[PDB]
Design a protein around this ligand. Sequence first.
Ligand code: EKY
Length: 719
Amino acid sequence: GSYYCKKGVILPIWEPQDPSFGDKIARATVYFVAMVYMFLGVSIIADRFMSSIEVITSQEKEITIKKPNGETTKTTVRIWNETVSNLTLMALGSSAPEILLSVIEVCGHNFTAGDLGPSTIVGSAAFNMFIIIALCVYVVPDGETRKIKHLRVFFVTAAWSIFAYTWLYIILSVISPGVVEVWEGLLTFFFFPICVVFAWVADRRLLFYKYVYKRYRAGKQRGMIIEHEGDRPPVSKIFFEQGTYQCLENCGTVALTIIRRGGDLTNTVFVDFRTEDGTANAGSDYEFTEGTVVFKPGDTQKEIRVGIIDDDIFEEDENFLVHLSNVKVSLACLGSPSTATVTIFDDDHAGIFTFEEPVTHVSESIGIMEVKVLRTSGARGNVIVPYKTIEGTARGGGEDFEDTCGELEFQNDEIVKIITIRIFDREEYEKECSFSLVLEEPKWIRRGMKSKEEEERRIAEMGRPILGEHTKLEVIIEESYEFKSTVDKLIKKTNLALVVGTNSWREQFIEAITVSASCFDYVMHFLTVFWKVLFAFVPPTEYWNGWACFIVSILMIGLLTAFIGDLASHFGCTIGLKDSVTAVVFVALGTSVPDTFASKVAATQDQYADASIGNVTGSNAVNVFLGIGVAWSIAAIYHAANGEQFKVSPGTLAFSVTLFTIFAFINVGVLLYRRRPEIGGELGGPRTAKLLTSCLFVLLWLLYIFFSSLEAYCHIKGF
Ligand SMILES: CCOc1ccc(Oc2ccc(OCc3cc(F)ccc3F)cc2)c(N)c1
């Protein structure tokens, strides 16, 4: 015999209270078994609580599907919007126990500091932050990562979560060392509105900044669909070899080849060559050229060059003739076709302007659709092309798609330009629609200024921006792909033959026979038979559109956590174990089982890993802030109404807080893997990381509980 007892909230003190060790243990192990059994109860209840705080804070869209048989199906289906708020309204629900327990203790035990609220708060904080993270690391698929994306806000969230626990040390040890004074404790609650407004503004901030791709997945509820962030998915005749030459104006200089064939090649030949205007004009289009071409002993051909003048005047097709004469053998002669009609192509304009196609099919998922134009027959000169959006099958005006029009200038020598437009994510299953993107006449710009020589100049000027064929784009609005696939999967699986005559209060009861009418499941649920049956009676499903379970399951959590508080109070200090220890060791691992499942499924199911850690951070923040706020606010106010100090214990907690903060800094540190870019993403992919970081975190949690227990044993620690 080492410890006496304290009267509970519901349960009374065990009658003899001090038998031999033959009974100082049996009642203790009975207590422990009843406690783990109530922990299973609380697990199932908080499961239902989360699954009914998710029906509220969610939108339902109506979907109709035309069956090929000749009829259709019209049914509304919820789509849980996964904002940042919808993770701080389920990091809270999932942490409903560790708050209410704290509320009961101080009320139950005569408005005095019952040291099983802070101990369980810190114990569950360390347990989650060191073990749920290990699971989020080593429960992902065999090899793959879901590395965090919004690392920009994790710093703030984690620095808040760790400012929370080192604030307990602040309230009761540094401003007043042993008192939760009246003014403090009030802000411990008011700091929760800080978090809620932070969520309620930093969701909108990152909502419109991101039209990012919203992947869809199947919630484990009846018909919930969860949206989240993802990525997007024998005479030597001499003559021209060719009597006609083709070349472009931009070349300037062009080459002509003149071949001697047959006869005696050893004779040096001198042949006069000279150019003459055909349709060409010297000094404006090309330069007149003349001279002598010399063939060495043994040559077969020679090359000459003539200059061609290029300008910004888009002239018509044009040519001029080069002629040869005066063949001298110093057997050989001037070959036939000794004149080359060099013909030229002018390209000094822009010309044809046409769209890609007149019709395209684009899903609403893109949101910002980016389609191009195309130029043909040159690009010189500047243009100003109007682009108009005209409504179609659906009604535009920035309702189904952002309908705006206007004008875009195409700079000189720019072949390709791409115009954008914005598109709504109406967030609904539909079919195709249509809209139009007609083009009209651009405005031409040449040189900034805007007898036959001038008339031919205008005959050249005719080259201007003329529209091509494709001048109006009727885009087709399509259906989001993943959304279609997910709703198809769900309809093929569930949500069939539904009407509210009797949905659950008659059918939440069938689980007994529905599950026990292979051999593993038997013993897997002969401990939950009672719990499930007792949990189908009182929290009936969402008849009140979400609030038909959240107004009851909270009361049942109150009942079960009253049982937990009383039994943990009467088990600790019965075997002799200090009351605080069994929080950090025993109660914490059972009050926070829902969190583990929530984070685990979030990690293994989505594509990122910020919700799975957002859960941990939100739970750690709300536990401490809300729990101590309400419990110690009411305690301090009660002692204020008649003038007392509320002398909470400074010690027995400070060491745990400081140790947790040190270990939490180590956590946040090693979270960013050493050499991370080739030690994989956040969760998985590297065998060594995935398989040893988890063991490190488990060792850290083990050291935490071990040293909390040691400090409670001997207390000789430096604090
Ligand atoms: C000053 C208060 O700081 C706070 C500290 C902790 C808090 O708890 C949570 C922390 C992170 C959460 O997820 C973040 C998230 C971001 C994202 F881009 C996409 C999905 C996400 F899940 C949810 C809850 C809150 N809400 C505020």
